[PDB]
Design a protein around this ligand. Structure first.
Ligand SMILES: Nc1ncnc2c1ncn2[C@@H]1O[C@H](COP(=O)(O)OP(=O)(O)O)[C@@H](O)[C@H]1O
Ligand SMILES: Nc1ncnc2c1ncn2[C@@H]1O[C@H](COP(=O)(O)OP(=O)(O)O)[C@@H](O)[C@H]1O
Ligand SMILES: [Mg+2]
Ligand SMILES: [Mg+2]
Length: 1154
């Protein structure tokens, strides 16, 4: 069952893609689908390409960055060679055409119709073989893409998480790798067959022009030899800028990644200016690289036009009067112009080719450095002599661990923050094979400390490739405290969980991960603090239902690592860790007995610059057509008059063309930088609702792809399109002038071409849309596999995931293949149209201009322009399609620009310093996340006296985090009044409101850089200040134990710091901010109670003269406060006296909970 049949048709059809007819006809009748399009052939599957590639890679290794390149060239092989041979034959015929022109003109001056028929056949043949060469190059490229994609996906498996902690294996870096390297390698492998025919082409060009010029060859030969070395030097100066360009863009992308996943914390206390100025500086450096590249390309185009025109002028002048004394018959003149144009076209192309060439080189260097990452080491739960560290060599954290875990038994690991608990969990998991030690125990379910979700439905995230079960799934759901929240969602179930779970809450994702690890059938289950983002009551219900009733039912083995009170009397073994060592060991008793798109684009381009561009282009082309017409009327013959006219026009042409190129490059640069500056400040001024709503992957990929296309694809493509359209205009005008009868044969051509273009347009749009809709999920899958590595390699589901990726990549490949096949079919029929027009143009010429018109000079112009446009027609159509795609790109940028309604900040209270008196009062407050949705708060009324500690309590979904977010005006549908020292938002813009408070979140984020950049991005602190802030935040000892104390390199999250240490760093931000009001949303989330109590005591003794409002799921912290308010289903209630607030409720909500 297949629909694509290129290898499955007859000899004559493969060239024309006749088979496509049905398909393109079918597409208009019914829209296209993935089940509509077929499967991939036997010789097209990514499995066989990966097979061939790995076999060649092995053969190359038995005999580095160069090795894989050799292997690629080997693997494509014969197909690639064939593409080159087809192109060379097409080139020889393309040169053959102008010779037929020479013969026709010669017989016109005096076996002529034969010249027309043979010329028509030759042109048709060249077109056929050129399009076949392009098709086979595209085939080789798509197979390359598939093979290297599956190779890197297989290698991501054996990659160790110690690389993932480093910047080299950054998830964003790996997805950038996949996407941009697909792109760059595919484009280089489409342009490589084109350049493997430039040398043979130029050689045949000169060997043909000798026999036409004679002794006057010297001038053209000197010109085309003087061209080469200066071009080599220019290309060198170009490549040097381009490589640094790539480095700077690669760092900008990671800065954007770490800027967007933390826009909440960024806008919370408004660190925006710092990150925005940093991205602006990176953009300025990138722009320096780009402007160097653009000036060099402008000089390149200047040379590639100026040297040619001088060559033509010199050669002709030399032949007529300088030495030769043989009158150049017009045939020689026009044939020389034709061969010369054929020679000129490759030189313009090679300059654009370098852009893809150095990019392919850089992409392969990156791919080889990625393949050279560290492997994974091939080998009751038993451990004797534990010893391992996180590098090939270094000081260890795992030292002398001995542990026995009998089946059907609960084991609580406990210990301070940073005691190798998760590390013991991962080493036991075999993900980290110890240096020296024995470990014995299978497919093990496991819920990691930082959960992750798949781009799928909830039911799918909980099944995880296992078949469904009526009672099993319902039990796992009804034990995880998840059914009410699931039913509250917009779709009662199968809700498409967004990327990473943005449209989910903090506790929801944790409960979903625990449900996944609890639903699967296995012996051993590891639970890595599954109680961080849960309250007291949900934790009690989950531990009682799933862990004690559901798990202990089947007598499975459970290793659960957390720190609570209820769990200890329930487990059988207890393991105390300290500084990577087991302090004590055993059971409990023995342990207790032991010791709208193009308008703004053109406006940003400038009404003065694009106008000058169009004007200069038109003027240059008018000069070019006029000089050729004048020369034609002169050749068939005031000789000095014509000589001066020719010499004047030959300088006018180069002046005008140089001006055109310079203007085009300037326009491109301006568009690039204005668009980027607009984009970033449109994203910065967005509300948090827009950031949570929008999928972030779309934002980032649109950002990178669109900006790269505009920076590097829009100038060249736009200028080539303009050149081709002006060439077409010139050719049509010339043919109309030479034969006023051709206007009878032009309308049928236009009508047929118009109808076929209309038919192609809808099928092309459909194929492009399907291409995008299949290309998004593949990259989603790549990202999710890269981040959720530990779980996938714990289950040992690697076969299932590799099979899934094979499915997705095969669908992507078939979509791309059909898009390029439709492209090829349109090109072939357009080339047949061009053959028709040139044929009957030459026929009407040889008939009319000889029999009845009797004109000599017009024949050369007519045939030259016809042979020129017969190729520039297809070239022009391709350039127009490229411009359309890039303009749709620009259009999606412009559509992204204008959303995120202003929500902007908009001086009587600013001039007065923000008061230290922390007296605040909220009267009749409500809150709604989305406009016209359910209310979250209702009739909120509270007051807070100056300099007093304030506690808040409540169940899940009560509204504590909503209370905090509304205290910062992060929820845009609040109703009521918020007064702070007789001062509210009535006279204050949002910036002074972002500077007045401090906030610590339950979700700890940490962007890469140094410790100084995480602690104070403003760089306005002394080192003693930060050392004191760390010694107060109970973090000094773990900071001193790192290389480069205050300058240790931090990566985004990673394992350089556990969750508790990230919480402590957020606390340190709060310490150094030095504001009057504090908000603390669960600073207890991932800190041990033993350290948490003393940490809270020290943080109370430190922040004595300022108001602090806390929301902690720890009872004792709530107990220590004076004014505590309990949030209800929608409302609150305040109470002050510790002895009165505990018996007034009749001991219900605050006493028995304690
Ligand atoms: N991949 C890694 N690279 C560097 N250091 C690590 C890595 N993994 C763990 N560590 C170190 O070992 C300790 C492991 O702490 P951990 O067991 O995760 O704490 P907890 O279980 O309380 O969250 C941390 O202090 C950390 O510094
Ligand atoms: N970003 C959001 N978009 C839409 N609804 C939200 C959002 N955040 C919270 N909610 C809703 O608000 C209610 C409770 O708010 P929340 O601040 O999350 O309470 P808690 O902090 O106790 O979890 C929940 O029913 C939840 O569905
Ligand atoms: Mg941990
Ligand atoms: Mg919360």
């Amino acid at each position: 069952g297949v629909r694509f049949l290129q290898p499955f048709v007859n000899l004559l059809s493969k060239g024309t893609y006749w088979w496509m007819n049905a398909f393109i006809k079918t597409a208009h009748k019914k829209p296209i689908d993935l089940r509509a399009i077929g499967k991939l052939p036997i010789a097209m599957r990514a499995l066989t390409n990966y097979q061939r590639l790995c076999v060649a890679f092995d053969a190359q290794a038995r005999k580095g960055a160069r090795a894989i390149w050799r292997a690629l060239c080997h693997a494509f092989g014969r197909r690639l060679i064939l593409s080159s041979t087809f192109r060379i034959l097409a080139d020889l015929l393309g040169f053959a055409g102008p010779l037929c022109i020479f013969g026709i003109v010669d017989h016109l001056g005096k076996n002529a119709y034969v010249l027309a028929v043979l010329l028509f056949l030759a042109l048709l043949l060249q077109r056929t073989f050129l399009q076949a060469s392009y098709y086979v190059a595209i085939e080789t490229g798509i197979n390359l893409r598939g093979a290297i994609q599956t190779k890197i996906y297989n290698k991501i498996m054996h990659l160790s998480t110690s690389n993932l902690s480093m910047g080299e294996m950054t998830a964003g870096q790996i997805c950038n790798l996949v996407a941009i390297d697909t792109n760059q390698l595919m484009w280089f492998f489409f342009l490589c067959p084109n350049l493997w025919a430039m040398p043979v082409q130029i050689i045949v060009g000169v060997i043909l022009l000798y026999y036409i010029l004679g002794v006057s060859a010297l001038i053209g030969a000197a010109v085309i030899i003087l061209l080469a070395p200066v071009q080599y030097f220019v290309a060198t100066k170009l490549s040097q800028a381009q490589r640094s360009t790539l480095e700077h863009s690669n760092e900008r992308l990671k800065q954007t990644n770490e800027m967007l996943r933390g826009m909440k914390l960024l806008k919370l206390y408004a660190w925006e200016s710092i990150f925005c100025s940093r991205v602006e500086v990176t953009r300025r450096k990138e722009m320096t690289s780009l402007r160097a590249f653009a000036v060099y390309t402008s000089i390149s185009i200047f040379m590639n036009t100026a040297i040619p025109i001088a060559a033509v002028l010199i050669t002709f002048v030399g032949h007529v009067s300088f030495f030769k004394e043989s009158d150049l018959s017009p045939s020689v003149a026009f044939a020389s112009l034709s061969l010369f144009h054929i020679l000129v076209t490759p030189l313009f192309l090679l300059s654009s080719v370098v852009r893809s060439t150095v990019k392919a080189l850089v992409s392969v260097q990156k791919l080889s450095e990625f393949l050279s990452s560290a492997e994974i080491r091939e080998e009751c739960v038993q451990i004797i002599g534990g010893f391992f560290t996180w590098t090939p060599d270094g000081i260890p954290t795992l030292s002398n661990i001995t542990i026995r875990i009998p089946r059907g038994q609960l084991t609580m690991i406990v210990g301070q923050v940073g005691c190798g608990k998760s590390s013991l969990l991962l080493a036991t998991l075999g993900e980290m094979q110890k240096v020296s030690g024995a470990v014995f125990w299978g497919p093990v379910a496991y819920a990691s400390q930082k959960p992750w979700l798949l781009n799928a439905t909830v039911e799918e995230n909980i099944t995880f490739e296992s078949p469904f079960n009526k009672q099993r799934y319902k039990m796992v759901i009804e034990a995880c405290s998840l059914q009410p929240d699931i039913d509250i969602l917009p779709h009662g179930d199968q809700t498409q969980i967004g990327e990473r779970g943005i449209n989910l809450s903090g506790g929801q994702r944790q409960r979903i991960s625990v449900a996944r690890a609890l639903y699967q059938q296995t012996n051993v289950v590891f639970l890595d603090d599954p109680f961080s983002a849960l309250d007291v009551h949900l934790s009690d219900h989950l531990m009682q239902a799933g862990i004690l009733e559901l798990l202990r039912d089947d007598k499975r083995t459970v290793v659960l690592v957390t720190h609570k009170l209820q769990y200890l009397p329930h487990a059988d073994w207890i393991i105390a860790m300290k500084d990577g060592t087991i302090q004590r060991e055993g059971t409990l008793k023995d342990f207790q007995r032991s010791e709208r798109a193009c308008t703004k684009y053109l406006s940003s381009a400038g009404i003065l610059l694009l106008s000058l561009l169009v004007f200069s282009q038109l003027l240059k082309h008018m000069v070019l057509v006029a000089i050729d017409y004048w020369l034609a009327k002169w050749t068939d013959s005031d000789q000095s008059v014509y000589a001066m006219v020719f010499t004047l026009l030959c300088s006018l042409g180069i002046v005008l063309c140089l001006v055109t190129s310079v203007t085009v490059e300037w326009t491109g640069l301006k568009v690039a930088k204005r668009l980027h500056r607009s984009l970033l400040n449109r994203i910065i001024l967005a509300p948090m609702r827009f950031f949570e709503t929008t999928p972030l992957g779309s934002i980032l990929n649109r950002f990178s792809s669109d900006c790269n296309t505009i920076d590097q694809h829009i100038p060249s493509t736009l200028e080539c399109l303009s050149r081709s359209t002006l060439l077409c205009v010139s050719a049509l005008t010339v043919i109309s002038y030479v034969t006023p009868v051709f206007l009878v044969a032009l309308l049928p051509l236009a009508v047929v071409c118009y109808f076929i273009q209309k038919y192609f347009r809808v099928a092309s749009r459909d194929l492009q849309q399907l291409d995008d809709t299949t290309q998004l999920p593949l990259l989603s899958h790549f990202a999710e596999t890269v981040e959720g590595l530990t779980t996938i390699r714990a289950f040992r589901y690697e076969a299932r995931f590799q099979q899934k990726l094979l499915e997705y990549t095969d669908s992507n490949n078939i979509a791309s293949l059909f898009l390029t096949a439709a492209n090829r079919w349109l090109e072939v029929r357009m080339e047949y149209i061009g053959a028709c027009v040139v044929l009957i143009a030459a026929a009407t010429s040889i008939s009319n201009s000889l029999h009845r018109e009797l004109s000599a000079g017009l024949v050369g112009l007519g045939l030259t322009y016809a042979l020129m446009v017969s190729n520039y027609l297809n070239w022009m159509v391709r350039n127009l399609a490229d411009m359309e795609i890039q303009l749709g790109a620009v259009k999606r940028i412009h559509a992204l620009l204008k959303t995120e309604a202003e929500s902007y900040e908009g001086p009587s209270l600013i001039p007065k310093n923000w008061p230290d008196q922390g007296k605040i009062q909220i009267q009749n407050l409500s809150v709604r996340y989305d406009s016209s949705l359910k209310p979250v708060l209702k009739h909120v009324n509270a007051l807070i006296s100056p300099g007093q500690k304030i506690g808040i309590c409540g169940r899940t979904g009560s509204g504590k985090s909503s209370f905090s977010l509304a205290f910062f005006r992060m929820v845009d549908m609040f109703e009521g009044r918020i007064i702070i020292d007789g001062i509210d938002i009535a006279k204050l813009p949002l910036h002074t409101l972002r500077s007045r408070l401090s906030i610590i979140l339950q979700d700890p984020v940490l962007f890469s850089g140094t410790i100084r950049f995480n602690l104070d991005p403003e760089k306005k602190c002394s080192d003693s200040t930060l050392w004191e802030a760390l010694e107060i935040a109970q973090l000094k000892l773990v900071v001193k134990a790192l290389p480069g104390g205050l300058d240790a390199i931090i990566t985004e999250g990673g394992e350089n710091f556990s969750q508790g240490q990230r919480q402590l760093f957020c606390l340190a931000r709060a310490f150094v901010r030095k504001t009057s009001i504090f908000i603390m949303d669960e600073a207890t989330a991932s800190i041990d109670m033993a350290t948490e109590n003393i940490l809270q005591k020290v943080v109370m003794t430190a922040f004595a003269d300022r108001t602090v409002v806390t929301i902690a799921h720890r009872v004792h912290t709530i107990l220590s406060a004076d004014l505590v308010m309990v949030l209800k289903r929608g409302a609150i209630l305040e109470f002050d006296k510790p002895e009165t607030l505990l018996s007034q409720k009749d001991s219900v909500f605050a006493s028995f909970v304690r």
